[PDB]
Amino acid sequence: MRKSVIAIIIIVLVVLYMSVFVVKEGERGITLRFGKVLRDDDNKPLVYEPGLHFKIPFIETVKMLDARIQTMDNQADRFVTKEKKDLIVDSYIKWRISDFSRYYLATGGGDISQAEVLLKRKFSDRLRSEIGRLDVKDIVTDSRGRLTLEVRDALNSGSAPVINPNSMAALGIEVVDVRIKQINLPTEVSEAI
Amino acid sequence: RVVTIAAAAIVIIWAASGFYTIKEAERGVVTRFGKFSHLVEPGLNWKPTFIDEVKPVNVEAVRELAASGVMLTSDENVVRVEMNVQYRVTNPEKYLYSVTSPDDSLRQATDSALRGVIGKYTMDRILTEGRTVIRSDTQRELEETIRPYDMGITLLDVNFQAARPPEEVKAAFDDAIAARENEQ
Numbered sequence: 217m218r219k220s221v222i223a224i225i226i227i228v229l230v231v232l233y234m235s236v237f238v239v240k241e242g243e244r245g246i247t248l249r250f251g252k253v254l255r256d257d258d259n260k261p262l263v264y265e266p267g268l269h270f271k272i273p274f275i276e277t278v279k280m281l282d283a284r285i286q287t288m289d290n291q292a293d294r295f296v297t298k299e300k301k302d303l304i305v306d307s308y309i310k311w312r313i314s315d316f317s318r319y320y321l322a323t324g325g326g327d328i329s330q331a332e333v334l335l336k337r338k339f340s341d342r343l344r345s346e347i348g349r350l351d352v353k354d355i356v357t358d359s360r361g362r363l364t365l366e367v368r369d370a371l372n373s374g375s376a377p378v379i380n381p382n383s384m385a386a387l388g389i390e391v392v393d394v395r396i397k398q399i400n401l402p403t404e405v406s407e408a409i
Numbered sequence: 410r411v412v413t414i415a416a417a418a419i420v421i422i423w424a425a426s427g428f429y430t431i432k433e434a435e436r437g438v439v440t441r442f443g444k445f446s447h448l449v450e451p452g453l454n455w456k457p458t459f460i461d462e463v464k465p466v467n468v469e470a471v472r473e474l475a476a477s478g479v480m481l482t483s484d485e486n487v488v489r490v491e492m493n494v495q496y497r498v499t500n501p502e503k504y505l506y507s508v509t510s511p512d513d514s515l516r517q518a519t520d521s522a523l524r525g526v527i528g529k530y531t532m533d534r535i536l537t538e539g540r541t542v543i544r545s546d547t548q549r550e551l552e553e554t555i556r557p558y559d560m561g562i563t564l565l566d567v568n569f570q571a572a573r574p575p576e577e578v579k580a581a582f583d584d585a586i587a588a589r590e591n592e593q
Contacts, residue, residue: 252430259451261433296573298537300583321434322470334473341493341570348572349537374566381471382495382566404580408590 234273239266242284244316248277253317261317281316281326285392288332294402295344301352301405306397307364309339312390319388331389338384339394342367356399364394427455434469438501445502466501472512476519479575486532489575494519494551496564503561511560522551527572535572544569 239245245264247254254276256262271278288309294302311331313319323330346363347355355363368391374380384391401409430453431437437449439461446461456463477491496515498504508514526546530539548567555562573579 249430253432255430255433255452296536296579300574300579302579317433318469321432321467337473337475337493341491342568344571344573345540345569348540370568374568376566378565380565381497382568386469386471386495386497 231273235270236268237271237278238268239264239280241266242282243280244283244313245269245278245280246316246320247271248279249275263316279320279326281313281320282328283313283316285310285312286328286332288335289397290336290340292398293340295347297347297352297355298349299352302402303347303352303355303399303405304402305343305347305399307339307343308395308397309335309391310393311335311384312392313388314385314390315388317388322387331387334387335384335389335391338371339367342370352401352405356401358399361395364396368394423458424455427458428453429456429463430454431463431465434467435465436468436501437463437465438505439463448500448502464501464505466498466504468498471495471497474512474516474519476516476523478520478524480524480527482527482532482535483529484531487575487578488527488532488535488572490523490527490535490572491570492519492523492547492567493570494564494567496562499561499563501561503559505561507560508558511562514558514560515555515562518551518554522547522554526550532574536574540569540572543572 237245243266246261247264247269253261288311290307290309292304292306295305296302319331320326323334343363346366350363371384371391373385374383379386429437431449431451433451437454439446439449439456440463441461449456449463472495474494474496475491476494480488480490482488494515498511504511526543527535529546530543535543544567547569548564551567552564555564574582
């Protein structure tokens with residue numbers, strides 16, 4: 217009665233260690249299945265808080281999505297103006313993951329890069345529209361982020377409870393702030409002034 | 410007794426594999442051999458294995474569609490316009506068996522729609538003033554273009570993105586300005 221008892225004891229201890237999985241403070245985990253996910257709370261995907269949880273070993277898989285505010289910086293790029301005065305603009309964006317479940321699907325594989333890529337195309341494109349209707353003086357003198365704030369409103373809430381697909385709310389993203397690092401007049405434009 | 414064991418073995422696999430759940434952003438499409446059967450909603454459902462199959466269609470995930478090109482204005486001028494069209498899908502009965510490649514089909518519609526609208530307005534207008542009307546017109550025309558098709562894609566909003574002039578004229582077509590500077 218020693219080999220049978222000792223055998224069960226050792227396997228049980230390793231099984232419990234594999235089943236336990238903790239969620240860090242700045243992270244959130246969504247337990248999944250082989251090809252499906254676990255659905256609880258009246259058909260609503262469940263995201264885990266930073267506490268202890270148990271998962272059947274080898275059946276459940278966890279994907280860790282960071283919940284900390286992410287910083288995305290855009291390199292220098294030229295933005296034509298109403299007077300054709302190209303303005304090299306350096307800017308960064310701050311966003312937070314709102315819907316961890318939706319974000320994982322859209323941005324397949326929970327990679328920060330894909331979300332930043334989508335945001336770069338959207339923000340850059342959105343920014344062009346505002347600068348197009350403004351003059352160089354209103355863009356270098358702007359200290360209340362009017363154009364940057366408007367871009368955020370458009371990205372957060374589009375035009376037409378319904379969540380527009382061209383808004384960042386349709387995805388699990390929330391742009392908390394948008395700022396421009398340097399609006400410095402390029403040399404080409406400055407020469408004529 | 411050996412026959413009973415064989416029946417049990419096949420039935421356990423049937424129930425195990427049969428159970429399937431669909432993610433929240435996807436909508437399974439259960440289909441009979443030839444005919445479609447029903448749309449299953451999220452949770453744990455069962456499908457008789459080898460009889461019906463499910464097709465997950467992403468009803469929530471956004472689908473990007475970048476449409477660009479060197480369009481022609483109404484004054485024989487060239488404008489480098491680029492557009493992005495974010496859209497969603499609807500019940501897969503239309504999306505899947507109405508027109509081939511609905512995602513690609515929308516891109517072709519966007520080119521025809523974008524080309525038509527820009528063609529009416531001038532380059533100078535489209536850059537600063539037309540920005541608002543171009544977005545409205547391009548949105549309305551694109552919807553009308555895919556109405557006969559009956560595809561299940563629904564366009565909510567089409568926001569014009571950029572109309573920057575060609576790089577050749579970005580630092581040209583300013584002789585009047587250079588004359589003003591020379592005048593001054």
